[PDB]
Design a protein around this ligand. Structure first.
Ligand SMILES: [Ca+2]
Length: 240
C-alpha cells in the first residue's frame, strides 16, 4: 500500500497473509480475506505459480512474533474457471483456498463480511485498502499491515479514456487514482473494505495497478468486484 498508515492491530481481522515456501522459510506474496473458518478468498493471479502456499491469520507484523498468528496449509485451490493468466483485464481474478484446518476465530481472526450479490457502490464511496504490499512503486513490502483510504471511482468514470478505458470491466471495482495512495505489489488478493449501512464489507479483491506504477493519477487501483461472484463463491464452498 502506497501512501497508507499502519493499521491498528485489531482493525481488519479478516485480512490474511498468503505466503509461499522459499527455501527454509516463508515469503509473503499476496493478501486474502478469510470468508469461512476454512476458506480464504484471494486473487486468481496470486496462485498461478505451482508453489507451496500457507495462510497466516491474525498476522500484523510479518517480521516479528505478534502472539496472535495461526498458520495453516492450503489444501485445495479453486480458481475461477474463466480466469486467464494472460488477460487480467478480462476479469475473473478470484480464487478460493480451502485450508487444511479450520482456524480459530477471536478478536484477531474474523470472517470478512461480503456484500449482497449485484451490489454496486455509488461513485466516491468510502473504502480502505489493506495489505503488506510495497509502500512505494518499486519499493519494499511493509513489515506491518497498512491501510489507505481509497474512495471508489465508478465504472462510467473508471472506463473512460483518461482512466482505464476498455481495460476496466463492470465486474471490477476501481478505487483511488489520486496519484498518492494505492495498492501495490504484494497487496493483490487482499480486501477493499467499504462502509455500507454502518458495516464494512469486502467489496474488492485487489487485482491490478498500472504498469506505469502503483500510485498513478487517474489509474486507480482495480479490484475484482466481490458482489459479481457471490453465487460462484457459494457454489464452490457448497461443493467442496
Ligand atoms: Ca507476526
Amino acid at each position: 500500500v502506497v501512501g497508507g498508515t499502519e493499521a491498528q492491530r485489531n482493525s481488519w481481522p479478516s485480512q490474511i497473509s498468503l505466503q509461499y515456501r522459499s527455501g527454509s522459510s516463508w515469503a509473503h506474496t499476496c493478501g486474502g480475506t478469510l470468508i469461512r473458518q476454512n476458506w480464504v478468498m484471494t486473487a486468481a493471479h496470486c496462485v498461478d505459480r505451482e508453489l507451496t502456499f500457507r495462510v497466516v491469520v491474525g498476522e500484523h507484523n510479518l517480521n516479528q512474533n505478534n502472539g496472535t498468528e495461526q498458520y495453516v496449509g492450503v489444501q485445495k485451490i479453486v480458481v475461477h474457471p474463466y480466469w486467464n493468466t494472460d488477460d487480467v483485464a478480462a476479469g475473473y481474478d478470484i480464487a478460493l483456498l480451502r485450508l487444511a484446518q479450520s482456524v480459530t476465530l477471536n478478536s484477531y481472526v474474523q470472517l470478512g463480511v461480503l456484500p449482497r450479490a449485484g451490489t454496486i457502490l455509488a461513485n466516491n464511496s468510502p473504502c480502505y485498502i489493506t495489505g503488506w504490499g510495497l509502500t512505494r512503486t518499486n519499493g519494499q513490502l511493509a513489515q506491518t499491515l497498512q491501510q489507505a483510504y481509497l474512495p471508489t471511482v465508478d465504472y462510467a468514470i473508471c472506463s473512460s479514456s483518461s482512466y482505464w478505458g476498455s481495460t476496466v470491466k463492470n465486474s471490477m471495482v476501481c478505487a483511488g487514482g489520486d496519484g498518492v495512495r494505492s495498492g501495490c505489489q504484494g497487496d493483490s488478493g487482499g480486501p477493499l473494505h467499504c462502509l455500507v449501512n454502518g458495516q464494512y464489507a469486502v467489496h474488492g479483491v485487489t487485482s491490478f495497478v498500472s504498469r506505469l506504477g502503483c500510485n498513478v493519477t487517474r489509474k486507480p487501483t482495480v479490484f475484482t468486484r466481490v458482489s459479481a461472484y457471490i453465487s460462484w463463491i457459494n457454489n464452490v464452498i457448497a461443493s467442496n
